[PDB]
Amino acid sequence: DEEKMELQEIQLKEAKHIAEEADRKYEEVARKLVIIEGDLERTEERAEL
Amino acid sequence: DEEKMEIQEIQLKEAKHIAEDADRKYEEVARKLVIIESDLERAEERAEL
């Protein structure tokens, strides 16, 4: 039991890095979109003007 | 030690669920960004005309 719980502990640490690295990409592409639709606002407004 | 065991693999399932869901929430954003970017180019040509 001691041996394979140590194994599960290192597996848990690896899974934690994988999850954090996965979340970073989404939190960056969200910021990219946030810039994008504001650019869309200003281009459309220039068009009506 | 068996108590510690059960805590460990239930945390493993929960972490794997989170890591699986995050990538789907990510991959929707790519097609949304592509579509809105095409619309932005469309509006830009509208304004230049």
JSON list of C-alpha atoms in Angstrom, two decimals:
[
{"chain": "A", "resi": 1, "resn": "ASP", "atom": "CA", "xyz": [0.00, 0.00, 0.00]},
{"chain": "A", "resi": 2, "resn": "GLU", "atom": "CA", "xyz": [2.82, 2.45, 0.83]},
{"chain": "A", "resi": 3, "resn": "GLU", "atom": "CA", "xyz": [4.62, 1.70, -2.45]},
{"chain": "A", "resi": 4, "resn": "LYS", "atom": "CA", "xyz": [1.68, 2.27, -4.75]},
{"chain": "A", "resi": 5, "resn": "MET", "atom": "CA", "xyz": [0.35, 5.30, -2.88]},
{"chain": "A", "resi": 6, "resn": "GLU", "atom": "CA", "xyz": [3.73, 6.95, -3.52]},
{"chain": "A", "resi": 7, "resn": "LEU", "atom": "CA", "xyz": [3.19, 6.04, -7.17]},
{"chain": "A", "resi": 8, "resn": "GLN", "atom": "CA", "xyz": [-0.28, 7.62, -7.10]},
{"chain": "A", "resi": 9, "resn": "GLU", "atom": "CA", "xyz": [1.15, 10.78, -5.51]},
{"chain": "A", "resi": 10, "resn": "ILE", "atom": "CA", "xyz": [3.61, 11.38, -8.33]},
{"chain": "A", "resi": 11, "resn": "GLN", "atom": "CA", "xyz": [0.83, 10.61, -10.85]},
{"chain": "A", "resi": 12, "resn": "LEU", "atom": "CA", "xyz": [-1.35, 13.25, -9.16]},
{"chain": "A", "resi": 13, "resn": "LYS", "atom": "CA", "xyz": [1.43, 15.84, -9.45]},
{"chain": "A", "resi": 14, "resn": "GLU", "atom": "CA", "xyz": [1.81, 15.11, -13.17]},
{"chain": "A", "resi": 15, "resn": "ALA", "atom": "CA", "xyz": [-1.96, 15.42, -13.68]},
{"chain": "A", "resi": 16, "resn": "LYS", "atom": "CA", "xyz": [-1.90, 18.77, -11.85]},
{"chain": "A", "resi": 17, "resn": "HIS", "atom": "CA", "xyz": [0.73, 20.18, -14.24]},
{"chain": "A", "resi": 18, "resn": "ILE", "atom": "CA", "xyz": [-1.23, 18.89, -17.24]},
{"chain": "A", "resi": 19, "resn": "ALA", "atom": "CA", "xyz": [-4.43, 20.58, -16.03]},
{"chain": "A", "resi": 20, "resn": "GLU", "atom": "CA", "xyz": [-2.70, 23.91, -15.30]},
{"chain": "A", "resi": 21, "resn": "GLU", "atom": "CA", "xyz": [-0.95, 23.96, -18.69]},
{"chain": "A", "resi": 22, "resn": "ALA", "atom": "CA", "xyz": [-4.28, 23.19, -20.36]},
{"chain": "A", "resi": 23, "resn": "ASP", "atom": "CA", "xyz": [-6.03, 26.08, -18.57]},
{"chain": "A", "resi": 24, "resn": "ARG", "atom": "CA", "xyz": [-3.37, 28.64, -19.56]},
{"chain": "A", "resi": 25, "resn": "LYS", "atom": "CA", "xyz": [-4.11, 28.38, -23.29]},
{"chain": "A", "resi": 26, "resn": "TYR", "atom": "CA", "xyz": [-7.83, 29.01, -22.78]},
{"chain": "A", "resi": 27, "resn": "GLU", "atom": "CA", "xyz": [-7.22, 32.00, -20.51]},
{"chain": "A", "resi": 28, "resn": "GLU", "atom": "CA", "xyz": [-4.96, 33.52, -23.18]},
{"chain": "A", "resi": 29, "resn": "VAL", "atom": "CA", "xyz": [-7.26, 32.95, -26.18]},
{"chain": "A", "resi": 30, "resn": "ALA", "atom": "CA", "xyz": [-10.10, 34.53, -24.19]},
{"chain": "A", "resi": 31, "resn": "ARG", "atom": "CA", "xyz": [-8.10, 37.78, -23.98]},
{"chain": "A", "resi": 32, "resn": "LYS", "atom": "CA", "xyz": [-7.44, 37.54, -27.72]},
{"chain": "A", "resi": 33, "resn": "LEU", "atom": "CA", "xyz": [-11.20, 37.36, -28.41]},
{"chain": "A", "resi": 34, "resn": "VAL", "atom": "CA", "xyz": [-11.84, 40.29, -26.05]},
{"chain": "A", "resi": 35, "resn": "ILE", "atom": "CA", "xyz": [-9.58, 42.48, -28.17]},
{"chain": "A", "resi": 36, "resn": "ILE", "atom": "CA", "xyz": [-11.17, 41.12, -31.37]},
{"chain": "A", "resi": 37, "resn": "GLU", "atom": "CA", "xyz": [-14.82, 42.05, -30.87]},
{"chain": "A", "resi": 38, "resn": "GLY", "atom": "CA", "xyz": [-13.91, 45.57, -29.75]},
{"chain": "A", "resi": 39, "resn": "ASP", "atom": "CA", "xyz": [-12.02, 45.99, -33.01]},
{"chain": "A", "resi": 40, "resn": "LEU", "atom": "CA", "xyz": [-15.24, 44.82, -34.70]},
{"chain": "A", "resi": 41, "resn": "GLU", "atom": "CA", "xyz": [-17.24, 47.51, -32.83]},
{"chain": "A", "resi": 42, "resn": "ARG", "atom": "CA", "xyz": [-14.98, 50.33, -33.95]},
{"chain": "A", "resi": 43, "resn": "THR", "atom": "CA", "xyz": [-14.78, 49.18, -37.59]},
{"chain": "A", "resi": 44, "resn": "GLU", "atom": "CA", "xyz": [-18.57, 48.86, -37.81]},
{"chain": "A", "resi": 45, "resn": "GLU", "atom": "CA", "xyz": [-19.09, 52.30, -36.23]},
{"chain": "A", "resi": 46, "resn": "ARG", "atom": "CA", "xyz": [-16.66, 53.86, -38.71]},
{"chain": "A", "resi": 47, "resn": "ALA", "atom": "CA", "xyz": [-18.73, 52.21, -41.45]},
{"chain": "A", "resi": 48, "resn": "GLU", "atom": "CA", "xyz": [-22.00, 53.86, -40.35]},
{"chain": "A", "resi": 49, "resn": "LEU", "atom": "CA", "xyz": [-20.23, 57.21, -39.99]},
{"chain": "B", "resi": 1, "resn": "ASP", "atom": "CA", "xyz": [-3.03, 3.82, 4.59]},
{"chain": "B", "resi": 2, "resn": "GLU", "atom": "CA", "xyz": [-6.10, 2.45, 2.77]},
{"chain": "B", "resi": 3, "resn": "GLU", "atom": "CA", "xyz": [-8.02, 5.62, 3.71]},
{"chain": "B", "resi": 4, "resn": "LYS", "atom": "CA", "xyz": [-5.21, 7.66, 2.14]},
{"chain": "B", "resi": 5, "resn": "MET", "atom": "CA", "xyz": [-5.51, 5.41, -0.93]},
{"chain": "B", "resi": 6, "resn": "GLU", "atom": "CA", "xyz": [-9.21, 6.08, -1.52]},
{"chain": "B", "resi": 7, "resn": "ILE", "atom": "CA", "xyz": [-8.72, 9.84, -1.13]},
{"chain": "B", "resi": 8, "resn": "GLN", "atom": "CA", "xyz": [-5.95, 9.69, -3.74]},
{"chain": "B", "resi": 9, "resn": "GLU", "atom": "CA", "xyz": [-7.79, 7.97, -6.59]},
{"chain": "B", "resi": 10, "resn": "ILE", "atom": "CA", "xyz": [-11.02, 9.92, -6.06]},
{"chain": "B", "resi": 11, "resn": "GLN", "atom": "CA", "xyz": [-8.94, 13.10, -6.44]},
{"chain": "B", "resi": 12, "resn": "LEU", "atom": "CA", "xyz": [-7.42, 11.54, -9.58]},
{"chain": "B", "resi": 13, "resn": "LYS", "atom": "CA", "xyz": [-10.85, 11.04, -11.19]},
{"chain": "B", "resi": 14, "resn": "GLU", "atom": "CA", "xyz": [-11.89, 14.59, -10.32]},
{"chain": "B", "resi": 15, "resn": "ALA", "atom": "CA", "xyz": [-8.69, 16.07, -11.78]},
{"chain": "B", "resi": 16, "resn": "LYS", "atom": "CA", "xyz": [-9.06, 14.04, -14.98]},
{"chain": "B", "resi": 17, "resn": "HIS", "atom": "CA", "xyz": [-12.65, 15.26, -15.36]},
{"chain": "B", "resi": 18, "resn": "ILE", "atom": "CA", "xyz": [-11.51, 18.88, -15.04]},
{"chain": "B", "resi": 19, "resn": "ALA", "atom": "CA", "xyz": [-8.68, 18.37, -17.55]},
{"chain": "B", "resi": 20, "resn": "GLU", "atom": "CA", "xyz": [-11.06, 16.74, -20.03]},
{"chain": "B", "resi": 21, "resn": "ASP", "atom": "CA", "xyz": [-13.72, 19.47, -19.79]},
{"chain": "B", "resi": 22, "resn": "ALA", "atom": "CA", "xyz": [-11.22, 22.35, -20.08]},
{"chain": "B", "resi": 23, "resn": "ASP", "atom": "CA", "xyz": [-10.04, 21.28, -23.54]},
{"chain": "B", "resi": 24, "resn": "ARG", "atom": "CA", "xyz": [-13.59, 21.18, -24.93]},
{"chain": "B", "resi": 25, "resn": "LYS", "atom": "CA", "xyz": [-14.29, 24.65, -23.53]},
{"chain": "B", "resi": 26, "resn": "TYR", "atom": "CA", "xyz": [-11.04, 25.62, -25.26]},
{"chain": "B", "resi": 27, "resn": "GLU", "atom": "CA", "xyz": [-11.75, 24.10, -28.67]},
{"chain": "B", "resi": 28, "resn": "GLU", "atom": "CA", "xyz": [-15.11, 25.83, -29.06]},
{"chain": "B", "resi": 29, "resn": "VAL", "atom": "CA", "xyz": [-13.26, 29.16, -28.82]},
{"chain": "B", "resi": 30, "resn": "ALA", "atom": "CA", "xyz": [-11.12, 28.45, -31.90]},
{"chain": "B", "resi": 31, "resn": "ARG", "atom": "CA", "xyz": [-14.05, 28.17, -34.32]},
{"chain": "B", "resi": 32, "resn": "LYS", "atom": "CA", "xyz": [-15.79, 31.12, -32.65]},
{"chain": "B", "resi": 33, "resn": "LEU", "atom": "CA", "xyz": [-12.65, 33.24, -33.14]},
{"chain": "B", "resi": 34, "resn": "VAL", "atom": "CA", "xyz": [-12.28, 32.19, -36.79]},
{"chain": "B", "resi": 35, "resn": "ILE", "atom": "CA", "xyz": [-15.90, 33.10, -37.58]},
{"chain": "B", "resi": 36, "resn": "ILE", "atom": "CA", "xyz": [-15.79, 36.48, -35.82]},
{"chain": "B", "resi": 37, "resn": "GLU", "atom": "CA", "xyz": [-12.44, 37.29, -37.49]},
{"chain": "B", "resi": 38, "resn": "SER", "atom": "CA", "xyz": [-13.93, 36.62, -40.94]},
{"chain": "B", "resi": 39, "resn": "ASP", "atom": "CA", "xyz": [-16.84, 38.93, -40.07]},
{"chain": "B", "resi": 40, "resn": "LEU", "atom": "CA", "xyz": [-14.35, 41.61, -38.96]},
{"chain": "B", "resi": 41, "resn": "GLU", "atom": "CA", "xyz": [-12.56, 41.51, -42.34]},
{"chain": "B", "resi": 42, "resn": "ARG", "atom": "CA", "xyz": [-15.98, 41.74, -44.02]},
{"chain": "B", "resi": 43, "resn": "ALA", "atom": "CA", "xyz": [-16.87, 44.88, -42.03]},
{"chain": "B", "resi": 44, "resn": "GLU", "atom": "CA", "xyz": [-13.45, 46.43, -42.79]},
{"chain": "B", "resi": 45, "resn": "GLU", "atom": "CA", "xyz": [-14.07, 46.17, -46.54]},
{"chain": "B", "resi": 46, "resn": "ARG", "atom": "CA", "xyz": [-17.56, 47.66, -45.99]},
{"chain": "B", "resi": 47, "resn": "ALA", "atom": "CA", "xyz": [-16.03, 50.74, -44.32]},
{"chain": "B", "resi": 48, "resn": "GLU", "atom": "CA", "xyz": [-13.32, 51.21, -46.97]},
{"chain": "B", "resi": 49, "resn": "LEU", "atom": "CA", "xyz": [-15.95, 51.16, -49.73]}
]
